[PDB]
Design a protein around this ligand. Sequence first.
Ligand SMILES: Nc1nc2c(ncn2[C@@H]2O[C@H](COP(=O)(O)OP(=O)(O)NP(=O)(O)O)[C@@H](O)[C@H]2O)c(=O)[nH]1
Ligand SMILES: [Mg+2]
Ligand SMILES: [Mg+2]
Lengths: 178, 29
Amino acid sequence: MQTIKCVVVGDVAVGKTCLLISYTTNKFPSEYVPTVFDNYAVTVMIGGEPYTLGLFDTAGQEDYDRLRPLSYPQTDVFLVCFSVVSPSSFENVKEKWVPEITHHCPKTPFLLVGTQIDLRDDPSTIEKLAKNKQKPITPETAEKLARDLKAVKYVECSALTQKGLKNVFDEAILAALE
Amino acid sequence: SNLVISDPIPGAKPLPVPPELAPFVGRMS
Ligand SMILES: Nc1nc2c(ncn2[C@@H]2O[C@H](COP(=O)(O)OP(=O)(O)NP(=O)(O)O)[C@@H](O)[C@H]2O)c(=O)[nH]1
Ligand SMILES: [Mg+2]
Ligand SMILES: [Mg+2]
């Protein structure tokens, strides 16, 4: 019937799988297992009619760079994820992920998704970043990159606390349907 | 209220996967 295919990409350990499992099942994964590929599906009512939202979970690992794009055909919307407390992941949105998805799927919309926002005001995390003179990514900085890369929208969330989490998918859904 | 989207409802039929990726799936699925 009606379907939306959403593919989620981004650096290793930015939180793609936690985002998906937390959203689709309201549980938080209890151990980190690197993803190769996983495929989830839920139903969402949109103006009172059911859509199947297919969520494709992909490897952040570079060794899956040649296999990953085999999952891309007929994608309706991408989530390009970076952790707001990992500057390297944010740089790779520009240097790796948006170039990759737009090469394969030039007409397909994507959202820039900042993850792990609960750690933005976490003293231990800030301390850890400050060791290497790093700083978290601010919303203003992310919005600027989203505009420059022609993302539909920048959204952010915490899979752990679920703050912003439903809104991420609401915006992905609307982007797929616009 | 026209762009309101419900909470997700579990256990829908997963969308088709390219057959060659089938073996690379799971266990998280
Ligand atoms: N505090 C906090 N930790 C998070 C959050 N999301 C994920 N994590 C943590 O970050 C780690 C990686 O999560 P994961 O979702 O597995 O990352 P991934 O992007 O799926 N990795 P891969 O590309 O290897 O599959 C885990 O240790 C997990 O606990 C979040 O919202 N908040
Ligand atoms: Mg994963
Ligand atoms: Mg389709």
